[PDB]
Amino acid sequence: GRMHAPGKGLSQSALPYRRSVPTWLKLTSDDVKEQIYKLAKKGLTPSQIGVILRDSHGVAQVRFVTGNKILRILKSKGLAPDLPEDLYHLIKKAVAVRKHLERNRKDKDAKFRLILIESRIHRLARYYKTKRVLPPNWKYESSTASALV
């Protein structure tokens, strides 16, 4: 069951049993990391990196090929973003909605969906403060939000 919907969807990605790398994949773990760096430098998220990789370069899971996963490869060298991509995207969506709702006070549905998105943010913020990957001093305020692109 979804967080802020009645939806009981089951559209999950389903990894195979065999964590063992396939045969055909000729790229060594280092050249995969080198290509991950090349994608990160272009300005892509670990989500967008992983998609571009498995599509055009036949690398199912970076964790399967290498040891580690894409953010931890970004983070080790310091190509990772300061605030997480998923909490970035909710703040990005909240600034989009709030801009729409500046000149559309009639749009009561928007206003309700804003409160649902605000709740997704506060909920993730609270999680990342327990894991100290955000400052304890940090708090998403909608007036301070437009600077956080």
Partner 1 sequence: VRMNVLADALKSINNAEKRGKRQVLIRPCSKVIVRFLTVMMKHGYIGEFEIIDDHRAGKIVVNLTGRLNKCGVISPRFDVQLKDLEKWQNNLLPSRQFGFIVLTTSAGIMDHEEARRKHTGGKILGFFF
- Residues at the interface with partner 1 (CB under 8 A): 15, 17, 19
Q: Which residues of 106-141 are buried (b: 16+ CB within 10 A; e: fewer)?
A: eeeeeeeebeebbebbeebbeebeeeeebeeeeebe
User: Quick one: which of 27, 37, 68, 79 contacts RNA (CB under 7 A)?
Assistant: 68
Spatial neighbors of 91 by CB under 8 A, at least 6 apart, are 83, 121, 140, 145, 148
What is the C-alpha to C-alpha distance for residues 72 and 116, in angstroms, rounded to an integer? 30
Q: How far is the CB of 76 from RNA (least distance, A)?
A: 5
Check residue 139 for interaction with RNA (CB under 7 A).
no
Check residue 38 for interaction with RNA (CB under 7 A).
no
Q: How far is the CB of 147 from RNA (least distance, A)?
A: 19
Annotate each residue in 99-118 with x if it binds RNA (CB under 7 A) or - if it does not, as one string.
Answer: -x---xxxxxxxxxx-xxx-
Q: How far is the CB of 130 from partner 1 (least distance, A)?
A: 19
